[PDB]
Write a protein that binds this DNA or RNA. Structure first.
Ligand SMILES: Nc1ncnc2c1ncn2[C@@H]1O[C@H](COS(=O)(=O)NC(=O)[C@@H](N)CCC(=O)O)[C@@H](O)[C@H]1O
Ligand SMILES: [Zn+2]
Lengths: 472, 482, 564
RNA sequence: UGGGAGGUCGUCUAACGGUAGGACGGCGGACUCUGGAUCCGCUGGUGGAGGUUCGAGUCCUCCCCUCCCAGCCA
């Protein structure tokens, strides 16, 4: 077996002697592979693994907007690099408390804000197969050092589909538990209402296996209250008798040709297992992204209000305070972020509140309510995670573009809604997969419909879609 | 009398909790070196979330109740955005829309006439930390120092209608407020250590009104004797107004605690745009009906009805009760005592005089001093039995409130049993005049307690004892044949 | 729906600068961005409860305990800049005997004026207490206010006192092991010990405006080198800390104050001199003073002083705030009044030992004879006999005990005391026979209280040019029977063998009989002609130590003063 | 206003919870001479309202008067 590819579960068992090399030969393969793909901002020195825990040895990587005591968390933004963590985000606490050994802090968009990865102010991150393209999403570097095989699995925040996007667009499995199942404590939050740390992995058995470890209520986030949720058990069980649902403007824009094509397979390659792929028409969902781009960068213009050169991070040695704040928040944030924190403060200003904001906050209970009971005639909804192959290194300098390059991802956020992105393509020669929305706070079921596809699909040999061979 | 003032004040309150406000740090952080009560959360570190402290809520409801506030089943948390070095998160957790308790009223003894005063809102806030400039107060220099210790200590900000009339009704409004809270256990309320803060509003026009005159506002002014003499001053100059061609206008003033004056503005942290949105980091607070009728039975009886009880419900007069119900500890030791001797009538007096006395001629509260109801119970049943004159039962009472010794015990030692036996009181009282005739002669004419002398003779000559009643009966008769 | 001003009210609200470069850069795609959202206007503008969070709306709120963060240190080694723990940011098998402290009191007057009967009791108090406990009396001029003071007032404050008989074992006039004993003579020390507290976390410096020494400028705990040579003023203040301060007090029992009532207070003036309260303590400590017994006017001051002591870490003394003697207007005497000053009562006639009698009596437990030396009194002395009220000074009583006093001592004594009084007053007496005067004294004394009285009454026995009372005439000379009598009188005496005392009373015990006028009117012409004053010692002693010589004269030179 | 300390004849000073006296002043006298000497008699007081007590200046609660600290005065 080449380790460049190796499900957590293959790692499960391989001799007390044989398996203790998996950490080392993970940083070892990084020194080689990494410089090309450019996915890691930290990469550990050389610290080592012991025992304690079902899942030891298994080296992981985690998005650098996720506080990790021992190694500078930075959100990939000049204002916040140089900041030593002061507490393990609970997800990482729970990870280490299990056996997992975190290796480096993976790149991303500036503050998890964007939809490619190049917007990161540290450096762009190239898609494993095709250094000319881009991982997409917000947690790109995560879902690209996993594909490439420097690590068994990763974690990543998802605000506008920020784990799904880069998984489908980079080739692997990204999961987004429901807003309320994974501690946001330790996640440098960009939007408090929508965010959620999820796995990013090779097998859709790990996307499901990570959850049953990185979860549970936490007394450090008062928005995670408990729930009887199982991500395993019913996993391997083809949806052999379930009605589904499909969008409508899902066919009213212009999906890249090669996309909806190797998508329409998902329709029948499921009906081949025997299930109603019927359709229903939702209206107000039409807006979502317009609604998500009020709320989110609104929450940003206060969630980020805290990075002020006052007490940590970057600080411009200016003689006055009115100066210091601004000239620090300017030369620190910069780039994309800048403009988000702007439109947001504007969403909350004097003569616009009930106008723009509150409205949107209600439309999110429009879309919320509609999308919802749709999960109450039948089971999963679904859609292509991606609306595009995987764009090239350079990009039409136009925010609007990115801010649309979602739709398929956004509304899952506006309800927490679980949602996997499992591969099932190779189209235009850039392996984009599909997504499977879920009932609000009804998880396990989407971790059935996942494995379903992952095997009962052409292309995927051994049960797991292939991994990009990397120049080394 | 001629011009009418309308005052309304804003009040902040430090709640005397344990756990801070949205985390697990101690919030009683006065004599604490700078930044020793920091925690990832209250310090605004990245990726920190607020966890509503239970106790912070308990306290609010208590004060909401006492303030006769329609409470609020449902209650949201909000974010008051703004920048300042003394405020980490870049915002503050308050309650703009949905205060836990809306609308109430506090009644003032009123240095004027006995009045009611309407509460408006009654929400919760986080409270920032100490920002001190480079050695100075209302001013400036080169660098300021932030001390976050205080960041995230449970604040309650009560706002009150422009009811208040007298810069005294003001003083006593907050005199009441402290003297309430220093009680139910939810604050020290002591303005000095910045535990009770306040700003205020004022106005005036005719003699009978149609509205008001828009505020002025007096932020800054610790001390109660300084909120008076300062709303005092912000009146002596509001009258030289439409009494000199002038309207009652806008602007804001603080007060120099040195001179005795007030000023306009210079700092300039104005009435900006605070952008109030709901705090997504916290899900809404919904107070269990099934629980809350459990914290109306937690909060203690306020000394106004603790009287009303004792009053027409223990037999005690308005006076006797009113006194007993000050020292709440004492008020307890009354009942603690009645319980064991269901005669309140006498228990009162004794604790009001003899007892309340040694709790002074040596400083203490009943609380720890060797005096159980089992002493009265004993004292009593003993006077009851006529082995002891109410006199002797007062003579003995210190050595008991001292030695703990049981009343009936110290009597079995000095032998103080009320000798009203044989009328050898008849005897002693005779020899009383044989060797003291200037006196009998005196009663032969000056009636007013002239025998008071002989009363004293018999006592002196029998250790406390005798028998007031009987000893007197005798004398006032042996002064009839001389 | 597209502006340029939004830059203020917006990039000002998220405190975000935007260099002239990326300025109109934002707007571009902010406009488009704004526009796209307009695809919202197609909605429901009424009743629709918003959503800020999914979930099931409860809270489930912590009931836990207070806990100090497990690694506070990383939060703080992550600050950009720091001072004293704060975040710093841009301005806007042989043994030995055991020694017990030895007894020592101080009378620490300030030369602000003349010493009154006030400071006299509250000084005699300290004096006696020292002389009874076998200790020492220390005397210290406290002249820290350099207007309110003087070397005359200081000078006269020692005289009045040396008069009351209050020898100090240590003072400004003869030194002592604890010199010096003026305070202006020891700025050497205060600034020393004052900075000993700005070393500590306890005192600090304060700078003011060059051209208005009222308004305060800055503070830090470090000497304003620059500012003190740029010609500003600086005080040192004592950092009151929070807490409670208390003490016992032999007279005023247990006493307690708390310091949320005492605001930060000046202990070193702009002019290098201490403030009162700081000045003591240092001096009061250094001067090894076991007991302070002072004016009730100073109780409300023993806190401020007690803070100081316990910040130098020094054992304080027993205290004892004695009451004031008041004026007739229910209020304390002072430098002000100035009409109740020891000097006064001295020359006005009052004998020292009698002031000390009354001062040792005004508001003391009487116990026994009311008239006594301050030595006799000693052997029955408890500083606890003193009453708690502020008594009022009562000259009436004073003069009463004054009188009872001269009449009760040896004659020589009063003599000396009279004569030495003469000078200080400055009456100028023309002495005579060293044992005639020493007889008209004997007589004159028995009838007068002060000494300005033992002077006026003694008066016509020496000076022969004595007046006649603008009143003795009025009902004795302007009388119709006058000349008839003064006349018969003159011969009744002019014819007198034995001039002793026996057949001298007789002489007149019949000039009466023969009915010239009433026994009275006669006796009082004789008297009021030979002395000039209606009231005088017993006429049988006066006309007897005047001589047939003088009586005849004086009998005569009014028979002429009768003229017209 | 706070904190402190005081509150019995006009002025000081007494009265185990048992007839509120003494001293100084004052008023009246006396001293076969005045009185500013001495003696003698008188006058005159518990700040206010209640509570406890057979009885309160004395013990309890509140109220009222006065004085002190609140000073780059001491
Ligand atoms: N009316 C009065 N009646 C009776 N005594 C009075 C008095 N007024 C002042 N005194 C007391 O006499 C002493 C000296 O007064 S003084 O010259 O003002 N000096 C001072 O007060 C300070 N220099 C000393 C204070 C101290 O003892 O520590 C000080 O003890 C003072 O309290
Ligand atoms: Zn904390």
């Amino acid at each position: 077996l080449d380790f460049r590819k190796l499900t957590i579960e293959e790692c499960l068992k391989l001799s007390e002697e044989e398996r203790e090399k998996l950490p080392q030969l993970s940083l070892e393969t990084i020194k080689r592979l990494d410089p090309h793909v450019k996915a890691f901002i930290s990469v550990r020195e050389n610290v080592s693994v012991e025992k304690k825990g079902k899942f030891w040895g298994i080296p992981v990587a985690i998005k650098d907007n996720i506080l990790t005591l021992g190694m500078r968390t930075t959100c990939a933004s000049r204002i916040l690099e140089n900041y030593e963590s002061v507490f393990d985000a609970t997800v990482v606490k729970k990870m280490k408390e299990a056996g997992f050994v975190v290796v480096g802090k993976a790149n991303l968009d500036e503050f998890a804000m964007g939809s490619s990865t190049e917007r990161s102010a540290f450096f762009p991150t190239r898609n494993p197969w095709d250094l000319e393209r881009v991982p997409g999403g917000s947690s790109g570097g995560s879902a690209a050092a996993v594909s490439a095989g420097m690590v068994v699995a990763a974690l990543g925040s998802d605000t506008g589909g920020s784990v799904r996007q880069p998984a489908s667009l980079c080739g692997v499995v990204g999961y987004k538990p429901t807003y309320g199942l994974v501690s946001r404590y330790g996640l440098v939050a960009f939007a408090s209402s929508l965010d959620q740390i999820g796995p990013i992995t090779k097998t859709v058995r790990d996307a499901a296996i990570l959850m049953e470890i990185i979860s549970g209520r936490d007394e450090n986030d008062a928005t995670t209250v408990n729930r009887k949720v199982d991500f395993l058990s019913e996993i391997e069980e083809g949806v052999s008798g379930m009605k589904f649902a499909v969008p409508e403007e899902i066919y009213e824009h212009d999906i890249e040709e090669g996309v909806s094509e190797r998508f329409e397979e998902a329709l029948k390659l499921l009906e081949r297992l025997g299930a109603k792929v019927e359709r229903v028409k939702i209206p107000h969902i039409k807006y979502s992204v317009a609604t998500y781009y009020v709320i989110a960068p609104a929450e940003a213009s206060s969630n980020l209000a805290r990075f002020d050169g006052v007490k940590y991070g970057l600080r411009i040695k200016e003689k006055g305070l009115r100066e210091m704040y601004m000239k620090t928040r300017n030369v620190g944030f910069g780039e994309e972020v800048r403009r988000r924190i702007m439109i947001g403060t504007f969403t909350l200003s004097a003569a616009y509140y009930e106008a723009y904001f509150n409205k949107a906050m209600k439309v999110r209970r429009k879309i919320s309510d509609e999308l919802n009971e749709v999960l109450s005639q039948y089971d999963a909804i679904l859609t292509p995670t991606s609306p595009v192959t995987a764009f090239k290194i350079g990009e039409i300098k136009d925010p609007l573009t990115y801010y649309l390059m979602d739709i398929f991802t956004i509304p899952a956020n506006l309800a927490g809604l679980p949602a996997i992105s499992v591969p099932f393509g190779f189209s235009n020669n850039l392996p984009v997969g599909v997504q499977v929305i879920g009932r609000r706070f009804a998880d396990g079921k989407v971790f059935r419909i996942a494995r379903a596809i992952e095997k009962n699909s052409p292309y995927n040999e051994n049960g797991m879609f292939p991994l990009p061979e990397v120049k080394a | 009398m001629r011009y009418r003032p309308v005052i309304g004040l804003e009040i902040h309150v430090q709640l005397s909790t344990k756990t801070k406000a949205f985390c697990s740090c101690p919030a009683d952080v006065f004599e604490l070196p700078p930044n020793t009560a920091i925690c990832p959360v209250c310090t605004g570190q990245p990726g920190a979330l607020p966890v509503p402290n239970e106790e912070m809520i308990r306290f609010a409801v208590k004060t909401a109740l006492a303030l006769n506030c329609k409470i609020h089943k449902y209650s949201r948390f909000d974010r008051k955005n703004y920048f300042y070095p003394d405020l980490p998160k870049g915002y503050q957790i308050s309650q703009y829309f949905y205060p836990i308790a809306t609308e109430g009223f506090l009644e003032i003894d009123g240095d004027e006439g006995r009045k009611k005063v309407r509460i408006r809102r009654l929400h919760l806030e986080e409270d920032a930390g100490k920002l001190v400039h480079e050695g100075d107060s209302i001013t400036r220099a080169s660098y300021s120092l932030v001390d976050m210790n205080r960041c995230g200590v449970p604040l309650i900000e009560i706002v009150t209608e422009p009811d208040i009339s007298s810069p005294r009704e003001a003083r006593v409004f907050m005199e009441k407020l402290r003297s309430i809270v220093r009680y139910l256990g939810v604050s020290t309320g002591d303005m000095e250590k910045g535990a009770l803060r306040c700003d205020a509003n004022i106005s005036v026009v005719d003699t009978e009104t149609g509205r008001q005159s828009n505020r002025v506002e007096v932020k800054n002014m610790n001390s109660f004797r300084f909120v008076e003499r300062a709303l005092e001053y912000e009146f002596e100059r509001i009258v030289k107004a439409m009494e000199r061609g002038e309207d009652v206008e806008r602007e804001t003033r603080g007060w120099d605690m040195a001179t005795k004056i007030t000023v306009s503005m210079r700092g300039k942290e104005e009435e900006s745009d605070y952008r109030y949105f709901p705090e997504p980091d916290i899900p809404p607070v919904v107070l269990s009906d099934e629980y809350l009728e459990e914290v109306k039975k937690e909060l203690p009886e306020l000394p106004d009805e603790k009287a009303e009880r004792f009053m027409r419900e223990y037999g005690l007069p308005e006076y006797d009760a009113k006194v007993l119900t000050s020292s709440k500890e004492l008020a307890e030791f009354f009942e603690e005592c009645v319980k064991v001797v269901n005669r309140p009538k006498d228990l009162s007096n004794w604790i009001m005089t003899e007892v309340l006395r040694e709790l002074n001629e040596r400083n203490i509260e009943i609380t720890e001093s060797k005096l159980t109801p089992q002493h009265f119970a004993d004292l009593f049943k003993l006077m009851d039995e006529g082995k002891i004159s109410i006199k002797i039962a007062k003579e003995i009472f210190p050595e008991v409130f001292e030695t703990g010794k049981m009343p009936s015990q110290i009597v079995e030692e000095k032998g103080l049993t009320q000798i009203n036996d044989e009328k050898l009181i008849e005897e002693l009282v005779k020899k009383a005049m044989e060797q003291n005739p200037k006196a009998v002669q005196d009663y032969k004419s000056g009636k007013k307690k002239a025998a008071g002398f002989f009363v004293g003779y018999v006592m002196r000559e029998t250790k406390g004892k005798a028998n007031p009643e009987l000893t007197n009966r005798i004398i006032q008769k042996l002064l009839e044949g001389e | 729906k597209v502006t340029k001003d939004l830059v203020l009210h917006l990039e000002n609200l998220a405190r975000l600068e935007l260099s002239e470069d990326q300025r109109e850069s934002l707007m571009k795609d902010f406009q488009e961005i704004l526009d796209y959202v307009e695809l919202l206007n197609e909605v429901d503008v009424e009743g629709v409860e918003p959503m800020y969070t999914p979930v099931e709306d409860s809270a489930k709120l912590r009931k836990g305990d207070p806990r100090f963060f497990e690694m506070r240190d990383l939060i703080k080694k992550n600050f950009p800049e720091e001072k004293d723990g704060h975040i710093k940011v841009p301005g806007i098998p042989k043994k030995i005997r055991r020694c017990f402290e030895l007894v020592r009191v101080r009378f620490a007057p300030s030369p602000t004026g003349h010493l009154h009967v006030g400071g006299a009791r509250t000084a005699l108090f300290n004096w006696m207490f020292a002389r009874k406990e076998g200790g020492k009396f220390i005397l210290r001029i406290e002249d820290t206010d350099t207007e309110r003071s003087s070397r005359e007032y200081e000078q006269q404050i020692l005289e009045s006192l040396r008069w009351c008989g209050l020898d100090w074992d240590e003072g400004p006039d003869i030194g002592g092991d604890f010199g010096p004993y003026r305070q202006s003579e020891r700025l050497e020390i205060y600034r020393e010990y004052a900075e000993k507290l700005v070393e500590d976390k306890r005192a600090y410096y304060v700078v003011y405006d060059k051209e208005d020494p009222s308004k305060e400028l800055f503070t830090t705990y470090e000497y304003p080198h620059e500012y003190k040579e740029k010609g500003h003023p600086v005080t040192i203040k004592f950092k009151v800390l929070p807490g409670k301060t208390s003490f016992e007090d032999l007279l005023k029992g247990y006493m307690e104050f708390d310091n949320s009532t005492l605001e930060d207070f000046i202990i070193m003036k702009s002019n290098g001199f201490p403030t009162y309260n700081f000045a003591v303590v240092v001096d009061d400590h250094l001067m090894r003073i076991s007991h302070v017994f002072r004016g009730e006017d100073h109780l409300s001051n023993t806190p401020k002083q007690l803070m100081i002591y316990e910040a130098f870490g020094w054992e304080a003394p027993v205290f004892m705030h004695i009451p004031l003697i008041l004026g007739s207007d229910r209020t304390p005497l002072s430098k002000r009044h100035g009409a109740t000053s020891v000097e006064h009562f001295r020359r006005e006639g009052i004998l020292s030992r009698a002031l000390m009698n009354y001062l040792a009596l005004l508001g003391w437990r009487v116990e026994g004879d009311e008239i006594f030396t301050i030595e006799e009194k000693l052997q029955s002395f408890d500083p606890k006999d003193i009453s708690n009220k502020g008594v009022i000074f009562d000259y009436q009583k004073l003069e009463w005990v004054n009188g009872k006093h001269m009449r009760r001592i040896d004659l020589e004594d009063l003599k000396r005391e009279f004569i030495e009084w003469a000078k200080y007053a400055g009456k100028e007496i023309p002495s005579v026979d060293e044992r005639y005067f020493s007889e008209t004294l004997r007589i004159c004394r028995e009838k007068v209280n002060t000494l300005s009285q033992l002077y006026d009454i003694m008066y016509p026995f020496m000076n022969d040019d004595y007046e006649y009372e603008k009143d003795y005439v009025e009902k004795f000379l302007k009388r119709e029977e006058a000349e008839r009598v003064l006349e018969e009188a003159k011969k009744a005496f002019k014819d007198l063998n034995s001039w002793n005392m026996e057949e001298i009373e007789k002489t007149l015990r019949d000039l009466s009989e023969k009915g010239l006028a009433s026994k009275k009117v006669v006796f009082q012409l004789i008297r009021g002609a030979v002395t000039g004053k209606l009231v005088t010692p017993g006429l049988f002693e006066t006309i007897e130590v005047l001589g047939k010589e003088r009586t005849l004269k004086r009998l005569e030179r009014t028979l002429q003063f009768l003229k017209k």
